[PDB]
């Protein structure tokens, strides 16, 4: 396989589908990628925790991200810059370390290299988050401040031969809710050229009306030829209308965090398990769904665990809300390659939302 | 396969290997009987908590637990009476739940009654247990009671048609640390008539010396064709010397308390997997095990798991020490079938408590 291919196999409206080939396997688009400590084609890696625990460095020496984890197919690592005080300036961000007091730096520069070091496939630009709501003047700044770090990134990606020959680099659009700024952005990445192209700044708060006003857009202005990543969305209905607007990959610690707390997704709507509703109930936690705990398993029986405070009953939960997450990218992409995702968006809605 | 048939295919000293056959299944002994809500050929089900979470009319409701949990081989119930206050007498024990107040009673009649609701195929008789250290006097007086407990399980039991064509029933022998009233106990179990022996009353904190000089005396008192079942017992050298005088099954939380709390069972000892000598070491739990968890990661990574709250550490650790234990009982057979069993003892303990 190549470094990085992207390829468009179907369209319908704003939506694709296709696939990225890279060395180490082929992602399916539209894609959802779950964070890897939790099939997928793809897992994300959180360089902020990473760098924290157990460390860039010790990673590196026990063979890098893919061996720790005991994943050989890609993945994608985040920058460190959103998780991410001691100083912040031009130049990137000094924080100390609340598990043991350590000193750490993010630069554009230190966040590619510690990217390298996790041996990522997928490397993030460093930028700085911009918060919601900000004014014109501010966004612009943050903006700004952005692209010259999207540049400074693309220039130590470059320089890191294995990472250059082996890795891909993605930029990220910024500018808050503001269209002028959107389209400055989107011009600054294309000219410093990216294999991809995120949309930041959209899981701030805003509401599903404000990011979708956003994305319509917001994702045109991006390059049509590379992949779109809409960075930390979402939920099963923000997925769908994300996707109906341009988005071709998405991550979210939703369904992990969902499961841990009594939440499961299902056609339906989530459901809270551990509802007295439940303590009888014979079905599985969806009706359609093909998970291993949906063929085998009551939502009564994981009520019990849950409730119990069984270990168990949380990782079913977690097994079922990322089967499930995989189950809709697929239904997504099924769709959009038979002409009729349109109609599967209507039918998820209505069906979604009736909550039954 | 018939109700209840217990067979001896090799001995070795006072060890023996075999297999208990019953409609469900077959059970190779010596036999380690996991928790259900944690391969095993029985799991445990706790009386105690199903009849105050969901109730043990709810199981039934429900379809038995064998529907409930998923689980279509046997299962062995407890009486509910250890974990069992409002009032205490000849007839039986009421208590109040903390969970919502309701009021609850435990009676040989009843638990018997509530162990048939559940479904189970190895019933315990309802006893009273005796404290430790416990005098003569006391420990006589608790004895006789559970004796005349176990003679009214035994009617209970009789008198439910379903149970007594499909189940199998055990009678407890209790005693404390007196072989006077061992044998008395013995004695009076053997008389009433049951198809399998537990011993009761040493997991009480006495220490490991204790426990095996009451069980050198103890053991032999039982019926030699029928199973003998250590209840609560224990650590991997636990249940090794209690085969070695006699015992044919075994329960205990630890695997799972401790795969909960960092802690992993190796052939080397056990290990706290969060110490930082871990964090570095790309070795699995255990160099021999051949579970799933020691095939794909190492040690390094559960240990970052844990350390970093993430649910997927502790499960990979019960999974780990489930499997651990299923492994130890299989070199038991394996070892007393081939008449190397005494060998074998020796080589696990001068390794296990090496601590390398
Ligand atoms: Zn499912
Ligand atoms: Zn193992």
């Not at 995120?198 to 857009?217: I, S, T």
């Not at 992949?227 to 994300?242: Q, R, S």
Request: with cysteine; charged share 25%; proline share 4%.
């Amino acid at each position: 396989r190549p470094r990085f291919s992207f390829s468009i196999a179907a369209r319908e409206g704003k939506a694709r589908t296709g696939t990225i080939e890279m060395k180490r396997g082929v992602i399916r688009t539209p894609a959802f990628m779950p964070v890897g400590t939790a099939g997928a084609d793809i897992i994300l890696g959180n360089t902020y925790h990473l760098m924290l625990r157990p460390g860039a460095e010790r990673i590196a020496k026990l063979g890098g991200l893919h061996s720790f984890m005991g994943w050989d197919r890609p993945i994608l690592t985040d920058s460190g810059g959103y998780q991410v005080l001691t100083k912040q300036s031009e130049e990137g961000v000094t924080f100390k370390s609340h598990l043991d007091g350590s000193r750490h730096m993010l630069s554009p520069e230190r966040s590619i290299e510690i990217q390298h070091l996790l041996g990522s496939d997928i490397v993030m630009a460093f930028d700085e988050c911009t918060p919601y709501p900000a004014t014109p003047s501010r966004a612009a700044s943050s903006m700004e401040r952005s692209m010259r770090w999207a540049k400074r990134s693309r220039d130590a990606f470059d320089s890191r031969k294995e990472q250059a020959e082996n890795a891909a680099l993605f930029g990220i659009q910024q500018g808050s809710v503001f269209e002028n700024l959107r389209q400055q952005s989107a011009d600054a990445l294309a000219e410093i050229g990216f294999d991809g192209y995120a949309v930041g700044g959209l899981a701030v708060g805003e509401g599903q009306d404000e990011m979708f006003r956003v994305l319509d857009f917001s994702v045109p202005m991006l390059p049509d030829d590379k992949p779109h990543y809409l960075m930390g969305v979402g939920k099963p209905d923000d997925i769908v209308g994300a996707v109906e607007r341009g988005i071709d990959m998405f991550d979210c610690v939703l369904p992990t965090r969902s499961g841990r707390n009594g939440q499961a997704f299902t056609w339906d709507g989530p459901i809270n398990i551990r509802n007295a509703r439940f303590s009888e109930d014979l079905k599985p936690l969806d009706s359609e769904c093909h998970c291993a705990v949906c063929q085998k398993w009551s939502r009564a029986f994981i009520h019990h665990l849950i409730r119990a405070g069984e270990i168990l009953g949380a990782m079913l939960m977690t097994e079922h809300n990322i089967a499930f997450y995989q189950q809709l990218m697929q239904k997504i992409r099924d769709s959009i390659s038979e002409g009729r995702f349109s109609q599967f968006a209507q039918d998820f809605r209505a069906r979604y939302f009736a909550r039954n």
